[PDB]
Design brief:
- The PDB classes it as ribosome.
- This is part of a larger assembly, with eleven protein chains of ten kinds.
- With 103 residues, chain E is an alpha+beta fold.
- Chain E has helices spanning 2-9, 55-62, 86-91, and strands at residues 12-16, 25-28, 30-31, 34-35, 40-42, 52-53, 63-64, 67-68, 73-78, 83-85, 96-102.
- Chain E is globular.
- Chain H is mainly alpha-helical and 99 residues long.
- Chain H is built from one helix and no strands.
- The longest helix of chain H has 72 residues, at 27-98.
- Chain H is rod-shaped.
- Chain K is 43% helix and 0% strand.
- The chains are: A mainly beta (116), B mainly alpha (130), C mainly alpha (92), D mainly alpha (98), E alpha+beta (103), F alpha+beta (149), G alpha+beta (180), H mainly alpha (99), J alpha+beta (54), K mainly alpha (321).
- Chain F binds chain G through residues 70, 72-73, 75-85, 87-99, 119, 121-126, 129, 135-136, 139-140, and chain G through 57-58, 63, 67-70, 77-90, 108-109, 111-119, 122, 124, 126-130.
- Chain D binds one RNA strand of 217 nucleotides through helix 4, helix 5 and helix 6.
Chain lengths: 116, 130, 92, 98, 103, 149, 180, 99, 176, 54, 321
RNA sequence: GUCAAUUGUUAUUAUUCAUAUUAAUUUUUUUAAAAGUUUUUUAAUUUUAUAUUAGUUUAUUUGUUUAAAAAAUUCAUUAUUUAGGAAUAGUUAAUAAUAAUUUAUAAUUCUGAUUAGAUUUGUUUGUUAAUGCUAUUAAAGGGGUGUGGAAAAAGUGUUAAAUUUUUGAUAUAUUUAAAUAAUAAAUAAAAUAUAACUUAUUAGUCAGAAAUGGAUG
């Protein structure tokens, strides 16, 4: 048995109007337009083990002015259904990847490419 | 049943012989009369009107009960003086009579019958309302 | 009907006695007046706890001293401002 | 275990009406009570002996004489509504249903 | 704080906070050339799990079949970060996470 | 008990004794020096019923809420339906609610002073409404054990 | 609405209707039987109280003996007691505020307690329904009708707002010379 | 449940319902009598339904009176403590600043 | 063999307890006497709930709909006051629209004392009413005919109100 | 305790709780509130009775 | 289980029924109920109050791992925390964020929070039967009318006993074809009448208030009458275990159906003559009441009466002790 | 702040694992059950909307008046099985009421996807001293004149339900479905209304309660 553990990072920093209302995570994907893929942590607590592990997932969020560069810390919130999979909007960006803007200012991709 | 012989009520023989004589001749009328007028004994009876026997407890046709007993329907004396089927007409002939005589029926006759007077109304001390 | 039922009501002395089941409603809000033996924060039955323990809402401070730069002598004396035949043993 | 009781007649005198002129018989009154074919009231008329016979028949007594449930329903208030002020005035609906 | 508690219960002769960051010293105390601390065990065999103790979960321990029994000593780290033995922990009726046991 | 008192636990009990004062000697050796609070007095004297009945009158309670009748509801239907109020079986009615009905607050749930007294009405078979006396009310709560050892 | 009508459960006025106080039996023998009174919407779904708004109380159909009374023989009003518990709080709400329906099945019981008058299906067969005519009721309405002014104080108090601030009370909530 | 008496207005058409729901001009009058007995007995409801609705409202206004009154005791206490915690806190940020 | 006390003291957050916490013998003798001591509603703690940014307004409108809609025909004049309470009971702090909506609806219904009750509630809630709201309560005070009320409310809230002098600028721009 | 071949536990209880053998080994011993469970298997075991005793 | 009033306070009073009114609701997976103890809420409660937040390894760790707070696997601060981070250490957070809410002032200045309405002005001005307001509004006149049964109940109680005293005065006499007077019948009723006054389970105390005004002066000494009864029952004619002749009727208990010698499978026992033992049982039965005469709190008088002393002395002389 | 408590006769030892109890299939007459829904003036028209199928694990989500009765939506987060494991495909996103051949190269996937196999997605069980192991729903099968407020619309019944009070003196109905019957299983009788099967019985006898003879070899 693996039961959802609400007490976590996003719960402790932000008062969530309902379950999972707001979330926080790193901007993994900005390939799609007006849609910054984010990886955030939703906790699962094992009563058997009595230890809780983190299962990280992928959420989409809508950034209007294309403000989210790869490697940023965003504080997203839930909202009305924008598409089949977007229901989040980037409420605020905490940590901007300075390099990501500058490494784009040089003319490159905001992150070196993966290896495999 | 709970108050086996605690009621000081007197028997039917001494009190109401006409009911005692109205009883169906159960051959034990010397015994049936000895019971109280209030008793819950489901005695048989004779149709005063319909020439048949009918089963109505002593107090029902009597209409009398002990203080502490839950009072009966206050108009039972007539309901059980008459054998039940043959009884219906009696209490309906009276009210239908005074019904057509004015074309009016209101069951509220009890209230005006309950009304002894505005003097009797003041037997209630009403409360100092806020 | 209404008057002649209220009128006969105006005669009987058994009336004019406030019947609780008619006069009012005991409690209107869905949450009870006080905590009544329900499972506590730690999951134990109310038999194993006493209401008003440490989980009780904080009673709150008494005074009000906003700053660290709270500098006033003749203060700090305004917090405390403390016949009869008592039995000797008990007063001991 | 002494427990007295106000007998069911003493709370309310249960007196049964005599037949009105419209259904003055034991049989014709039961003929009035076949609202739907599932209650064959008419072929069960003979089961009761007279007017005053039908009226006092109880849940145990009606049942023991073989009266099926739908009849155990329909025959009842034909008496009761009659006691209350509604004699069994109901146009049979078999043909329209059928 | 734990050694401070065990000391006041006497399972150890006496601790000392040398204020060294790494390690401090505690003097064991023997009786009948047998160590006073028969069975001492850390509550959470793993750091990932941190079991917390209701003021009743401790109170059930003090009663071994109807006799108020303060033999075993459990240490609790209160929410206020006061290292407290289970005995005092039920006294002022406050819970905390469970560090270890000793008896 | 299996408590392990410290080696110096009664020190405050000592400097009390080692510094006690007594005006007359009998005070020093009085037989009821042990008795400090009422919780002590109730037990020490709980043996001799004699003083126990005469010192504690409140233990043998004699004051209960008098069985009080409640007025009915004047029904506009007239006497045509007023037969229903009278019946065979005296109906017992008790109040249930998210507020009231719980065991722990029983001593408050039936307090004669608490404005929120749980409501218990018995419709007597005649039709009158009376308050249920304390015996029936408690029967709506669960049972309890009690006996003089 | 459905080409196949839900035959064994036909209900009026579409769905999903307002609350109705109902009597749900827990299907066991009559000895073990004990019904419920509960505020549920009109239609019943097969998920068995999926749609229960609020649970009022419990009724026992079997006449129980002395409910552990002191076995008082002297009252003589110690008939077989019929226990019944009812949530007056919620009922005062749903009946009054949300205007739920009221089914006769339970209603007869509530009438016993003092909340409500006898139900309709309760028919005093000895006392039939009376006859009515406007004329003889006019003279009564002509004879004894309450004054308009007094009645306006009655219904207003009886229906709108019982709590009316008396001058004495009004004399208290009047402020004082510090800030008056 | 609409009832279809026998002397009710009949229709001699076999295409549909045979009996019609069109009363006899006496069944109108018995109705206005039997319908009245309801109105005679029913007008008690809208009297009660206003009464019970009145109490429950006044109930909510006197019960929640004590509640808001008591809840205010808690929040005023809980908050005065929170501004006091940041006070008991800020001195630590000071002393740790000294360290 | 592992200690039995451990086998209990280990699984304190056992999913059995989790149900009794709601995360996903029985007489009156056992329950403590200290139960009957808690005063009315003391058992409840403070509650600081954050609601959705939109639902902050929708919920206000429904409250704004009842108060200014209570005095239609059926709902009692008092009802306007009962909706102000149900909001406050559930921690929605009552905004100035819900205050004016009460005093207006209450005055229209001839209820003057109750119209002051709404004013004391906002005196209890320690909500400082703006000038628009201050004049509102004074309006019922006119129907109330009490100088003792207006004088009281005068000192407390509208003391520093000063006429716009010729030299002062104009209605201040939004600064918050 | 792990006497070689078994892991035996002794714990308090309201009364004597054990199998038919261990019942007497505590009762014929003299204990009253004892409670014992012999590893529920006595891990290092052939089927031998002395391991229940030692 | 958790109660249901938890649902309302978090979401809204009576928010339940509005949600129930959904057309497509509960089929097949309902929206379950949010019943979570108020101190265990995900959002509102801080770390110092919610125990679950005090978890470290996957809880507070990530926070200090994000905030930059020097954090260890165990330390002096709340959760795996050693010292403040550079930000907390340098910036003043007293008045940053939401302004200090005005309702705080309510605490130090508490006169504002006051119950506008009298809790008794709810409709319960007379729910307290013993209050001063109750007797005032009811007046002295209707005051007794509220409790005519409490007087009638108590008074009818005695008139059961005063009647029983006379009927079963002398137990030797017979009241049936096999029915006899006996001392137990008055006692077990009286005990039951003393049961109502005194018991904890069958608990009725109001009756004693009415004793002063519902007492029969014929029974001011309830217990002398009790002792005057055994002196009658001491006669050697009828069985002391049976109240029937020990010769006429062979086996006792047939004649009074309530006799406990008959059980689900209770057989019979022979009769007995009046012997020393059945002199002694009377003695202890005579004794037990004597001490009770003064020790009985509800009925027994304060001290013995001249009617009592001669009454017991009668039983002694008769029982030949 | 009142209830956690473990019972196999083993067979060198290691290894949860044959013969035990609990709960189940075995296991048996005491709860079902058949058709004809019903209105209406118009050959018509009002009112009569989710058990039983077939194969689904990133899955199933919702009402303008219909009723009630006098500006609330089509979206979502989560959790998803196979022992030995590699690709998927009317694509994704942005335009827009475009896009049968627009614009990007996109989208899923080893954090185990798609196809295939089994399973109807679980406040329901059982076991237990207990984290656990171990069950459960009678329940939505595409679109093709589009009705209706909502497709839930040629099986699949049973609820006191269907626009006059049909009827509650009823709970009883006999063939196909769950639903634990050896109900004081053996001595004194049933405050009965007398109807139910009818006889209603088996196992053991080396080890461990208990055997000799007779065969056998």
């Amino acid at each position: 048995r693996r039961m959802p553990w609400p007490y976590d990072l996003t719960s402790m920093i932000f008062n969530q109007p309902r379950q999972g209302s707001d979330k926080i995570g790193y901007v993994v994907g900005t390939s799609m337009l007006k849609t910054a893929v984010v990886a955030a942590n939703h906790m699962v607590y094992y009563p058997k083990f009595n230890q809780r592990v983190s299962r990280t997932s992928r959420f989409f969020a809508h950034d209007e002015d294309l403000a989210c560069v790869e490697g940023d810390l965003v504080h997203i919130k839930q909202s009305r259904k924008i598409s089949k999979y977007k229901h989040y909007y980037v409420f605020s960006i905490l940590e901007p990847n300075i390099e990501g803007r500058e490494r784009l200012k040089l003319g490159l991709k905001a992150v070196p490419p993966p290896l495999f | 049943e709970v108050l086996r012989e605690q009621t000081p009520v007197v028997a039917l023989r001494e009190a109401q012989p006409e009911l005692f004589k109205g009883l169906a001749e159960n051959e034990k009328n010397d015994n049936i009369g000895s019971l109280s007028v209030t008793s819950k004994f489901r005695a048989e009876w004779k149709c005063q009107s319909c020439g048949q026997p009918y089963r109505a407890t002593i107090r029902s046709r009597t209409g009398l009960t002990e203080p502490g007993q839950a009072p009966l329907h206050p108009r039972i004396t007539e309901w059980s003086a008459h054998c039940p089927a043959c009884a219906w007409r009696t209490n309906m002939t009276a009210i239908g009579r005074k019904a057509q005589e004015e074309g009016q029926y209101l069951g509220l006759e009890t209230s005006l019958a309950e009304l002894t007077g505005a003097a009797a109304g003041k037997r209630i001390p009403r409360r100092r309302k806020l | 009907f209404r008057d002649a039922e209220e009128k006969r009501h105006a005669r009987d002395v058994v009336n004019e006695l406030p019947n609780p089941w008619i006069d009012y409603v005991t409690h209107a809000l869905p949450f009870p007046d006080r905590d009544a033996g329900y499972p506590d924060e730690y999951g134990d039955i109310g038999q194993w706890r006493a209401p008003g323990g440490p989980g009780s809402p904080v009673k709150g401070p008494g005074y009000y001293a906003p700053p660290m730069e709270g500098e006033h002598m003749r203060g700090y004396t305004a917090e405390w401002r403390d016949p009869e035949p008592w039995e000797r043993k008990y007063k001991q | 275990a002494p427990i007295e009781t106000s007998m069911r007649s003493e709370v309310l005198p249960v007196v049964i009406r005599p037949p009105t002129s419209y259904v003055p018989n034991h049989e014709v009154f039961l003929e009035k009570a076949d609202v739907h074919r599932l209650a064959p009231t008419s072929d069960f008329k003979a089961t009761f002996k007279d007017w005053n016979d039908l009226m006092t028949c109880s849940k145990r007594e009606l049942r023991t004489r073989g009266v099926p449930l739908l009849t155990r329903r329909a025959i009842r208030a034909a008496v009761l509504a009659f006691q209350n002020g509604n004699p069994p005035e109901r146009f049979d609906t078999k043909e329209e249903w059928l | 704080g734990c050694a401070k508690v065990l000391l006041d219960h006497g399972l150890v002769a006496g601790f000392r906070d040398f204020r060294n960051d790494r390690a401090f010293a505690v003097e064991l105390k023997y009786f009948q050339n047998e160590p006073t601390i028969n069975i001492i065990e850390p509550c959470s065999y793993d750091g990932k799990t941190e079991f917390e103790w209701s003021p009743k979960m401790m109170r059930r321990l003090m009663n071994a079949h109807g006799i108020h029994n303060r033999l075993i000593i459990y240490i609790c780290r209160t929410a206020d970060n006061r290292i407290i033995d289970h005995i005092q922990a039920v006294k002022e009726c406050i819970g905390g996470r469970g560090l270890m046991m000793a008896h | 008990k299996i408590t392990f008192y410290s080696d110096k636990f009664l020190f405050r009990d000592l400097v009390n004794r080692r510094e006690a004062s007594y005006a007359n000697v009998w005070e020093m050796d009085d037989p009821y020096r042990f008795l400090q609070t009422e919780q002590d007095y109730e037990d020490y004297w709980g043996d001799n019923y004699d003083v126990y009945r005469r010192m504690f009158p409140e233990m043998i309670g004699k004051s209960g809420e008098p069985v009080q009748q409640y007025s009915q509801m004047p029904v506009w239907a007239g006497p045509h339906r007023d037969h229903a109020n009278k019946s065979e079986h005296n109906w017992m009615f008790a109040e249930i609610g998210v507020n009231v009905g719980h065991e722990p607050l029983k001593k408050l749930e039936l307090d004669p002073t608490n404005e929120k007294r749980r409501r218990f009405v018995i419709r007597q078979p005649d039709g009158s409404l009376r308050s249920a006396k304390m015996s029936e009310m408690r029967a709506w709560y669960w049972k309890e054990e009690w006996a003089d050892f | 609405a459905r080409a196949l009508v839900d035959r064994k459960s036909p209900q009026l006025w579409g769905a999903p209707g307002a609350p109705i106080i109902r009597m749900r039996g827990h299907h066991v023998t009559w000895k073990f039987q004990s019904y419920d009174m509960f505020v549920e919407h009109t239609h019943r779904r097969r998920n068995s109280d999926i749609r229960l708004l609020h649970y009022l109380g419990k009724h026992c159909p079997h006449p129980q003996k002395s409910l552990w009374s002191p076995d008082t023989p002297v009252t003589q009003d110690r008939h077989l007691f019929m226990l019944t518990t009812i949530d007056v709080d919620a009922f005062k709400y749903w009946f009054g505020v949300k205007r739920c329906r009221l089914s006769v099945g339970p209603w007869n019981i509530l009438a016993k307690s003092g909340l409500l008058p006898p139900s309709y299906k309760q028919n005093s067969k000895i006392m039939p329904k009376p006859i009515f005519d406007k004329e003889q009721l006019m003279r009564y309405y002509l004879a004894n009708r309450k004054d308009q002014r007094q009645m306006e104080r009655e219904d207003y108090l009886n229906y709108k707002n019982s709590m009316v601030k008396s001058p004495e009370e009004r004399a208290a909530e009047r402020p004082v010379a510090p800030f008056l | 449940r609409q009832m279809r008496p026998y002397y009710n207005l009949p229709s001699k058409s076999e295409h549909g319902r045979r009996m019609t729901g069109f009363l006899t001009p006496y069944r109108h009058w018995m109705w206005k009598q039997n319908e009245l007995w309801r109105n005679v007995h029913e007008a008690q409801f809208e009297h009660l339904r206003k009464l019970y609705k009145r109490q429950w409202l006044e109930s909510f206004r006197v019960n929640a009176d004590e509640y808001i009154y008591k809840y205010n005791i808690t929040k005023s206490a809980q908050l005065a403590q929170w501004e006091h915690e940041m006070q008991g806190q800020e001195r630590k940020r000071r002393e740790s600043q000294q360290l | 063999m592992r200690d039995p006390s451990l086998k209990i003291l280990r699984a304190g957050s056992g999913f059995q307890q989790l149900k009794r916490m709601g995360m996903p013998f029985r007489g009156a003798d056992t329950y403590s006497v200290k139960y009957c001591e808690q005063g009315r509603y003391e058992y409840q703690r403070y509650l600081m709930i954050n609601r959705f940014p939109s639902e902050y307004k929708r919920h206000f409108l429904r409250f704004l709909g009842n108060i200014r809609g209570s005095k239609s025909r059926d709902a009692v004049p008092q009802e306007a006051l009962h909706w102000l309470l149900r909001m406050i009971v559930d921690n929605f702090n009552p905004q100035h629209v819900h205050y004016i909506a009460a005093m207006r609806t209450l005055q229209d219904s001839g209820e003057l004392d109750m119209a002051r009750d709404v004013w004391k509630i906002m005196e209890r809630q320690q909500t400082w009413p703006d000038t628009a709201t201050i004049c509102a309560y004074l309006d019922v005070c006119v129907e109330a005919g009490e100088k003792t009320w207006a004088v009281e409310a005068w000192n407390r809230y509208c003391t520093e109100l000063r006429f716009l002098q010729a030299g002062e600028v104009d209605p201040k721009p939004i600064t918050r | 305790i792990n006497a070689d071949g078994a892991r035996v536990l002794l714990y308090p209880a309201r009364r004597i709780i054990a199998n038919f053998r261990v019942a007497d080994i505590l009762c014929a011993f003299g204990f009253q509130n004892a409670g014992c469970k012999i590893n529920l298997k006595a891990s290092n075991n052939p089927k031998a009775p002395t391991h229940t005793v030692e | 289980r958790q109660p249901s009033y938890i649902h309302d306070k978090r979401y809204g009073l009576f928010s339940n029924e509005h949600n129930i009114g959904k057309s497509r609701r509960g089929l097949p997976h309902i929206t379950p109920i949010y019943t979570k103890h108020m101190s265990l809420w995900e959002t509102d409660t801080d770390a110092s109050t919610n125990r679950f937040f005090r978890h470290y390894v996957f809880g507070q760790r990530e926070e200090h791992l994000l905030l930059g707070r020097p954090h260890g696997f165990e330390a002096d601060q709340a959760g795996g925390r050693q010292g403040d981070s550079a930000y907390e250490l340098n910036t003043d957070q007293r008045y940053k964020g939401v302004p200090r809410p005005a309702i705080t002032n309510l605490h130090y200045e508490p006169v504002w929070n006051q119950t506008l309405y009298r809790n008794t002005a709810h409709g319960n001005q007379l729910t307290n039967p013993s209050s001063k307001l109750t007797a005032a509004v009811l007046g002295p006149d209707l005051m007794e009318v509220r409790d005519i049964k409490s007087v009638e109940h108590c008074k009818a109680w005695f008139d059961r006993l005063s009647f029983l005293i006379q009927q079963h005065y002398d137990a030797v006499g017979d009241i049936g074809a096999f029915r006899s007077r006996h001392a137990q019948h008055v006692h077990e009723f009286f005990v039951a009448f003393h049961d109502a006054l005194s018991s904890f389970d069958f608990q009725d105390r109001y009756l004693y208030d009415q004793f002063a005004k519902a007492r029969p002066k014929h029974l001011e000494d309830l217990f002398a009458i009790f002792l005057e009864m055994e002196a009658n029952y001491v006669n050697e004619a009828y069985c002391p275990r049976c109240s029937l002749p020990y010769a006429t009727t062979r086996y006792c208990g047939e004649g009074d159906p309530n006799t406990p010698f008959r059980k689900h499978r209770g057989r019979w026992a022979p009769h007995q003559y009046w012997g020393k033992e059945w002199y002694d049982v009377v003695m202890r039965r005579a004794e037990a009441l004597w001490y009770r005469a003064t020790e009985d709190p509800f009925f027994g008088t304060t001290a013995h009466t001249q009617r009592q002393a001669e009454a017991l002395l009668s039983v002694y002389v008769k029982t030949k002790h």
